[PDB]
Amino acid sequence: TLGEMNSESLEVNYRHLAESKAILALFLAKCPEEMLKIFDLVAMEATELHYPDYARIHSEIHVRISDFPTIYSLRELRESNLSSLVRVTGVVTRRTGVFPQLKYVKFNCLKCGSILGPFFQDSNEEIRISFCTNCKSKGPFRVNGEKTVYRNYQRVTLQEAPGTVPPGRLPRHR
Amino acid sequence: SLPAHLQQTFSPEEIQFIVENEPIKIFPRITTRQKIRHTRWQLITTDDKALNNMVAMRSTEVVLWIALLLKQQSKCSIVAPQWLTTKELDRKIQYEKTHPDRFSELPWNWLVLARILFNKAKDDFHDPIHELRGKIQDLREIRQIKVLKGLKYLNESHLQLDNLSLLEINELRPFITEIMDKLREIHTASLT
Amino acid sequence: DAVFGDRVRRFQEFLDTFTSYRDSVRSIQVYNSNNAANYNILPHRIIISLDDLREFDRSFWSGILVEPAYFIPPAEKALTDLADSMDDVPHPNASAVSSRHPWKLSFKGSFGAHALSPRTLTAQHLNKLVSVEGIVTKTSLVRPKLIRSVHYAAKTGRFHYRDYTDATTTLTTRIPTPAIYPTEDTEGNKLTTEYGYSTFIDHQRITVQEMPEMAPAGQLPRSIDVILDDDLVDKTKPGDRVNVVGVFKSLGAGGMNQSNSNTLIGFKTLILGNTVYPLAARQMLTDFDIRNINKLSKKKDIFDILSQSLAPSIYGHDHIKKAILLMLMGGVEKNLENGSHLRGDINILMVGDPSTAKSQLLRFVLNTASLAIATTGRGSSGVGLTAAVTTDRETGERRLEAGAMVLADRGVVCIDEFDKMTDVDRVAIHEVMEQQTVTIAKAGIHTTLNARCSVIAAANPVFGQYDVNRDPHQNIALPDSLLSRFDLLFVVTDDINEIRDRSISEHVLRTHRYLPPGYLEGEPVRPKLVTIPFLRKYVQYAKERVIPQLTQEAINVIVKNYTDLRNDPITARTLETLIRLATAHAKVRLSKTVNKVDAKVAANLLRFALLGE
Amino acid sequence: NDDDNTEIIKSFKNFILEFRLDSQFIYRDQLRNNILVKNYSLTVNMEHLIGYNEDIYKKLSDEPSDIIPLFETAITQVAKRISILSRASLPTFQLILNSNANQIPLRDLDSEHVSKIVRLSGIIISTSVLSSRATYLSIMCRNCRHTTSITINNFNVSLPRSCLSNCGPDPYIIIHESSKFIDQQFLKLQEIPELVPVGEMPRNLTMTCDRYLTNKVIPGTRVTIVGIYSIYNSKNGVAIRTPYIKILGIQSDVETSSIWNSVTMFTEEEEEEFLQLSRNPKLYEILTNSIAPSIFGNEDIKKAIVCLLMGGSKKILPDGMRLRGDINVLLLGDPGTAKSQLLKFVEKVSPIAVYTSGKGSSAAGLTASVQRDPMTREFYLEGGAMVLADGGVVCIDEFDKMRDEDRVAIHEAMEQQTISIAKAGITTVLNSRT
Amino acid sequence: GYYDIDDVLADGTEFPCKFQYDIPGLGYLENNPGRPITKNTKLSLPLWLARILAIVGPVPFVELLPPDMFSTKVMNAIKTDPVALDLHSINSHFFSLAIKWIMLFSEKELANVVSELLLQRAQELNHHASSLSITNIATSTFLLKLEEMEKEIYKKSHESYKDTKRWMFKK
């Protein structure tokens, strides 16, 4: 049913990882980014085992992890939940438009013939270019059209739901 | 009695008729020649001696409506003239690009005959039809540029061209004649 | 340059061919010398006709109308040389020697395709001389701009001058000067700036918006910003139907800098205004027009002729059109010694049934007045009628822009649907009707603004149709205090008839059967009666020329009529209202005295306005 | 790389010079007839370019922004070959594409279609003022006083840092006397309401036009647009570069004659067919049956609708008396008489038409509104529903329910055909012939 | 020509003129029932009266004043830009009236002006007539600015070019 309408999302129930291979669920709960970085390649290989030459339709596959057993509201988020998966209930108040974002940023050094290597974007802060691979100093950098990859980007202001907040209090915004 | 669009000018199909009434070299594919051992042709507006002496796979000279009528039968194949080659058309293009003030020494029936042989003789050209029609269009465009340049000299007295085609005379006839007629009317009203 | 000098001698040959410009320069110089040195100053500008230069040199005419940056400064240099050679003055002033404005060029004549509009100003007309027509809007404040600084060195005792160039001042592009005064000289040691010998010009930005009658379907009017040179500063007020001739120029980096790598913004485009034409609100009066005006003033029924000459398409409302005529030529204003401001501007409120052509009379007095501003009940705000405080772009300073009711000063305000103002707008309107000045105290600004303007307004009753029950409260929904300031409360009833209704029907079918002259039949549009420009000339002549004064033979009639009208909705103000009629009819007769025939007509018109006659 | 660029230029030159369908060089004749009316543009069908050479089709459709200027150079070279005699001027041209591709909706426009030619459809809601972009720049060095030239193509460059004769760090200024400029009009596109996704809002997308594509659409029309989906950086988080569409082609059957000039742009055989329709003895019943074929009865309403669509004649008198050339029709009656369906069909049939509510209306919404520009902090008038319907039809649903202050802002706009607004220091009389 | 209907509408235009004699009984010229005409009366009359009323009369009956269509403003506008001038708003049959005015008053400068104008608009007329679509705004706005004889010449040239286009381009 991923292949049926050319979808790119493969939903995985976390309870299925709880029943079998709970070490994998623990690794996903503790280090989610690297676990999903392995999991998308695993799901792409599992798709190509059943749908060969599916990479022409969608070059990268993505996995939506479903039903995390711990639900944290916006008031209950603390420092221990950083770099981890959180399940947050809230209402969306402000939604920006669709924006193209460079999945891999690469730049051309003007003074040197060498080009700067493609770096993956984390969608939090821009990649800090301290120097170049041939010259150890800052220079003019602009995006080459040799290898460019664009992905969709959209921020939403997830306000806490007013039935979820304590009565009369203020909502929280993330 | 005469229609308004045929009043002071010729229609292009009348120009087609006029250039259908010329001789042209041709290759017969039938033998009408009497041997030493068939109604005759017997025409009254052209010499029928070349048509009575029609020999297969030879060069004869017949009128162009007979040429098209027999090409429709495919009993006789029309030979293109000397100026319908790529080399001669390139020479004419070079003469047009060499002298800007003077038109090239093309025949009077160079657009009408080319259209007739393009729409009726698609397998009778030694050169390819493709670059032939390209050079025809190039000559037409550069002659259009030259007549646009020469139309700035619309004089009250007279105006001369050297080798403009009959189809280009019907291109430019009503505009030039009406504008010069009104210029002459203005100056003759200006006379005391 | 060599080509610069060649165009200099070409324009010198042109000025030698036509000696009228030399005579005008000589007249300007001798007028300045007579009115300045000896016991209101003509500036440095000449009226260049493009047509007179077209038969001289078509190359120079095409250079002016196509690439004016290389053709107008050589003509400036040639005209400056001719003005220097023509001037022969002994013992000049040091400020006169150091600060000389070059003789600028002002252009007249036919332009052809270059005579344009602010909507159709496009990128192919940049760096070309164009003539545009439109509404003046958003006049920036007059502020001086330095173009030459003169400094004195005392250790050497020498005066050093430095020229200062801007993108807007010079048609050609020069390297910009950062406007820093020279602190010290390279050889003269310390330098002291000498203001007074330095040269400053007045700088002003206006905004020419497209004339709204020429707007196409579905599009808002466009606008341009026009720089005004120091001779042309303060020639234009907002709401003026100006014709500006100037060089349509673009300036600035405009996003071509390295910071703006992929910003799709365009270049900032302006017009360096060579000349400004009013386009004749105060029409000039030839002597033949004066002869016609004084010939028709002697007729006994000139009031009737000029009344039915107003809007022949409108049938009926003859006394209303008489009041409209006395409204356009409003009465004399008297300012007393103690300071009481006695209003000479008659104001008219027309209340009544729908389709009695009150708004059509509003449109007619909009078109035929010297200055007219319209407004609507639901399309007006009280701040938007008087004045609004906003920042200015070139100054970074807060200032007022006048609203509808102030910009129509010495003019008329055409209020439609007056019965349905918001109360905030009613406060401001009532303030003008009782005070004629508005006091603005906000944004750190304490200012008073004069508004000596007339008001004609149209209204419906509080019901759907006007009642014949003569109820005082159901005439208007506005309070009676605002009713009191209106001098003539005309009420109209569309009573249903047969004969007069057939007359109005045949009149409007004769109105619809008109075909405008010079236009094809069935195509889309792209007992003496005087013409409407002649009527406007009559109104202008009566307004500026004659000031009538009041005389007893009207006065006994006026006091008898007031006692008859009041003692047998009446106000003491009605007395002043009779004066606001009576001398107004004197302005019809053009005499400087008021007689009995003005007062009888005034009493008849006010009896028609109040009682209905 | 310049060898491949001039090979592309020569190949598209050969495409213009050598294309012939049914014994006719369509593109050379198109260029000649476009030059003769001083319309320096060339309209190219994509089917014709594919039928010539599909390799050229991938060269166009792969990186369009780097090859469309090469095609522009090829068109200008063909134009100088055609209309200029050698050894005895013309500015840059414009390539306008026509495509018959399936229309990509606005919500499906995403990061996959970046720098690709897409064909879409939408509703114009705002056309901005024309801005003067530059093509030829005479760049002057401030120190050594030498003048170079920079040629600007409006795809995907700035002032360089060396003077190309220390001379100076940034020694360049721009001479505006010898610079050539083209137009650029900004547009805002709203998507088709029939193709909006479920539960969302129509997304406005900013678009641009250059040269002769400017001033072609009135706001409110429904248009199909072909163009490249490029990205430009905006002055307003991380790596957010706002998308836009550079328009290569505009098509609209509902919209005619660009900004209205009372101009006859209908073709000759369509004009003869229209004359035949005007000569029909029973065209009145044809126009009556054309209005609401799925509504029984209401024949007099259909006749009044046809009279509304044709309208009267606007007349001008020498005394300034302007009389109305439009008729306003109010359908008052019971529910279930299909009045709102007649309103919807009138909005469909009319070329300029808007459909509004009584509850969803406002005084500044139907008439023109006074809004504030964000950057300049200056008030400006933005047109409402009776400005977008100027020269056409406004339709009001539930007229009985619109507010008493809201009904009476329409009186001058119905009768005087104008809106006189004096608010916020701006006073004007806009024309609204609705 | 007698039967030229364009010439008939050309003669139907009214020109301003001055009456030289005190002529009673012609009050129907200025739509009055019976007013005798005073000395030096300024009045607009059609050309079929005033063309030979200025001939017969020595002092003739009617003096032809210079109208607005031949004023110095119109002459300067023609001399500046002949192509984009809107001749239709001035007069729909400006050229036939110009020819009649030149034949009546032999003015050489007006002859040079109208000849130069006719040449410059004939170039643009030929440019719009040779263009065949496979209508533009740039051609149809010039058709909006054309006279009746000029659109007659454009119709002749345009149908000639279109007919030879369909002859050359198809059977």
Ligand SMILES: Nc1ncnc2c1ncn2[C@@H]1O[C@H](COP(=O)(O)OP(=O)(O)O)[C@@H](O)[C@H]1O
């Ligand atoms: N001669 C006339 N007599 C009466 N009414 C007329 C005449 N000529 C025009 N009208 C009508 O007067 C109407 C304008 O009045 P209206 O718009 O009702 O004023 P307001 O907007 O102040 O109520 C026009 O619709 C026009 O049809």
Ligand SMILES: Nc1ncnc2c1ncn2[C@@H]1O[C@H](COP(=O)(O)OP(=O)(O)O)[C@@H](O)[C@H]1O
């Ligand atoms: N004559 C008819 N033909 C077809 N449908 C009709 C007809 N009359 C009513 N209807 C249907 O009934 C509904 C009537 O709605 P309508 O009367 O337009 O709403 P409103 O009362 O707001 O005007 C429509 O949806 C329409 O489909």
Ligand SMILES: [Zn+2]
């Ligand atoms: Zn480097």
Ligand SMILES: [Zn+2]
């Ligand atoms: Zn340098």
